[PDB]
Amino acid sequence: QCVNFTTRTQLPPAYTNSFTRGVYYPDKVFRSSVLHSTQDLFLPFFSNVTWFHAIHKRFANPVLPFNDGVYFASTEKSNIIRGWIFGTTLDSKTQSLLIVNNATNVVIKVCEFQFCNDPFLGVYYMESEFRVYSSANNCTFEYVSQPFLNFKNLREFVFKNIDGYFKIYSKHTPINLVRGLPQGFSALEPLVDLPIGINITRFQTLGWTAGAAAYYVGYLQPRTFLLKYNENGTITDAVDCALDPLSE
Amino acid sequence: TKCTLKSFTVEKGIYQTSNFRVQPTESIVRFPKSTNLVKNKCVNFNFNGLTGTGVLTESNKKFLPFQQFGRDIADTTDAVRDPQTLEILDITPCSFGGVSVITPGTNTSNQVAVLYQGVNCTEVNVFQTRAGCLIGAEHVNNSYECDIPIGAGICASYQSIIA
Amino acid sequence: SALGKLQDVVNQNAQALNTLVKQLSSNFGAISSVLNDILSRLDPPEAEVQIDRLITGRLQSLQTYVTQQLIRAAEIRASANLAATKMSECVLGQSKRVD
Amino acid sequence: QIDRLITGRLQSLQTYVTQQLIRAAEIRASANLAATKMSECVLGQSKRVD
Amino acid sequence: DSTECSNLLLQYGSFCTQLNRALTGIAVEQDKNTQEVFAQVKQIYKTPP
Amino acid sequence: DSTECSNLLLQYGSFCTQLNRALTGIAVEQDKNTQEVFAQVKQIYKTPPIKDFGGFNFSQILPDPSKPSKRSPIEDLLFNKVTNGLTVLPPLLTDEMIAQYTSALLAGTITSGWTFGAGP
Ligand SMILES: *[C@@H]1O[C@H](CO)[C@@H](O[C@@H]2O[C@H](CO)[C@@H](O)[C@H](O)[C@H]2NC(C)=O)[C@H](O)[C@H]1NC(C)=O
Ligand SMILES: *[C@@H]1O[C@H](CO)[C@@H](O[C@@H]2O[C@H](CO)[C@@H](O)[C@H](O)[C@H]2NC(C)=O)[C@H](O)[C@H]1NC(C)=O
Ligand SMILES: *[C@@H]1O[C@H](CO)[C@@H](O)[C@H](O)[C@H]1NC(C)=O
Ligand SMILES: *[C@@H]1O[C@H](CO)[C@@H](O)[C@H](O)[C@H]1NC(C)=O
Ligand SMILES: *[C@@H]1O[C@H](CO)[C@@H](O)[C@H](O)[C@H]1NC(C)=O
Ligand SMILES: *[C@@H]1O[C@H](CO)[C@@H](O)[C@H](O)[C@H]1NC(C)=O
Ligand SMILES: *[C@@H]1O[C@H](CO)[C@@H](O)[C@H](O)[C@H]1NC(C)=O
User: Fold this and answer.
1) CA of B62, closest atom in ligand 7
2) Residue whose CA is closest, atom 1 of ligand 7?
3) For chain F, N or C: smaller number of CB within 10 Å?
4) Assigned CATH for A14-248
């Protein structure tokens, strides 16, 4: 089942500043009171991060490229954002990745889904509406896990696909800022490593009323960071090696 | 010492002749079979595919739940998390040290003393110095002029060999 | 920055030791910098070549470290000879030498 | 082939840096001597013979 | 300007950093030598007319 | 600990002996430097208990009895202000003995002037 949404309001997507967000732990190695220089796929400091809104009538689900990796930020309250779609052609021709977080658990499936143009979930005022795909024929990987999840909640995720490994990094932050990204530093802990081994070039974010939510999409570039590890092994500050001559 | 110096007569002094390595005794292979963990001994450890040789002791470092191994400034693995039981272990490198021979002239005597540099005396007339463990020299409380330098204020002389 | 000369010597020696330890992580054109990985992954005819590449790289690093250690030893020896001269002529006597 | 060129050029550069450091030590010793002569011969009268 | 040569050169580690640091030390040492020899007075004296 | 690596390393000859000999020469040279700088007197001079020097105060350079290290306040400040087969050999002269040598030199130059450097 698929449903066209024909009540949208035309508006260009916004842009804002990344500040010093998007830093994740590059590996599983504990380091304490040290300064470590690493070259990896990172989000540049103070970059132009794309801003999308969900407000009522805005429902921003466009088609975005994936490129080398995607930093996904969410200023969320009342749990509207539920999951992501990854793939190349987003149909039964190629193999696609499904990540959903419904009312009970988090489900990851790698199947050849015949996706809808507007895949979505629904809450009736309980969850009794699910229209994401019409078929699933060849499934290779399944993974059922625990639930991962004024704007009150900040969700940071980093999605990377290197050597057939899908790295998902996550961080949950209590915030009380009304409209934009708070200015600060928070290192993203690694959440899961999935051996999906599939090509990903495009991704999707998952009458009617749209709850108040906002999300941000940034793109990773190969660069060097200098990370500071404190006495407790937590990354507390970072330096972008190619941002400005002072940080260089 | 005669072999190292390429001479049959050795002048009075201290000569670094060899090295000592505490040889590994057991192999501990812990993945998430699991060979019974042995601590406080120089063993060959294989933890989740990370291999090496070291002494596994208790650690006061509180790891974050996602982190498994630990590295210092010089990118050497000095801390690790046991996969079976979530405890933190320090990996101290197995003792290695220079072996120096302290002797007077062969014209005077053939008595020698052995200094293990930077090695505690429990891991080898046994005396513990800051330079290392000295075997074969009788420690005295008197102070004399330095005849053969040992280090850290310690000197050796022949009168038997005293330190 | 009053005591910069001693801190400079300590920093240079520590930096040389850190660089020498860090050079073990380099494979010097071999498949890996770990000897155990080479010995467990390859047959001895090609593992001999890989170990030879590691040996020549590490030996070049060690010779380089010894070379700058000898040069710094010469510099410190000259400074120590100057310090001994100052101890003999300024502390143990009165010097007519200007400055 | 590039590896052979790299090791040859790196050996040449390390050799050049080594003699540069040795000449730097010699020039530093000469400069220390020159500073001593400037302090003792120009800024005062020296009783040191020759 | 060869990218492949630089990629192979990165396998040898921090030799280039060592050589650049040594040359930088020599270069600052020359200026220190010139300061030690010539800059021993903080007053610029002038002869009478 | 690789036996095969050491067997291949033996083909290159006595490079390791040369490097160890050079490092040993540097290590003994450091102790020789410390002997040349600080051990220039064979008598350990001491100051009188009464510090009556005609108004001259040497408390900041004489050793402090209250400190366990027996260092001067200036020397204590100086010590506070300075912060895989590798071994660090300890120096032959420890810091307290070097401080004792400096104390002997200070006592000699205060109580005897330059006479102790040239004889009795
Ligand atoms: C919702 O709208 C999309 C976009 O118009 C529909 O996708 C089209 O499906 C027809 C099927 O005949 C294709 O010919 C078009 O090329 C498709 N358009 C695009 C942009 O892919 C989709 O079918 C609609 N959903 C429903 C249930 O009708
Ligand atoms: C020599 O100088 C020292 C320090 O300059 C004097 O010690 C001071 O004594 C006064 C009064 O007793 C104290 O209030 C100061 O705190 C002391 N200073 C220190 C650093 O302890 C000392 O009295 C002077 N005279 C003699 C004869 O030693
Ligand atoms: C971000 O991009 C938009 C267009 O893509 C541009 O108008 C805006 O000025 C950019 N902002 C910054 C800070 O570069
Ligand atoms: C959530 O999804 C899983 C997998 O599709 C399903 O088994 C479960 O019943 C779902 N939960 C709800 C409340 O629908
Ligand atoms: C994928 O599914 C189609 C039809 O559902 C089938 O013909 C094809 O063999 C499947 N391929 C694999 C690799 O399972
Ligand atoms: C992945 O897909 C893109 C476009 O669909 C294509 O250009 C690229 O070559 C593909 N890569 C692999 C490894 O299949
Ligand atoms: C590190 O943890 C200790 C408690 O183990 C705490 O007292 C200290 O403040 C922490 N430091 C930082 C920088 O978080």
Assistant:
1) 5
2) A232
3) C
4) 2.60.120.960
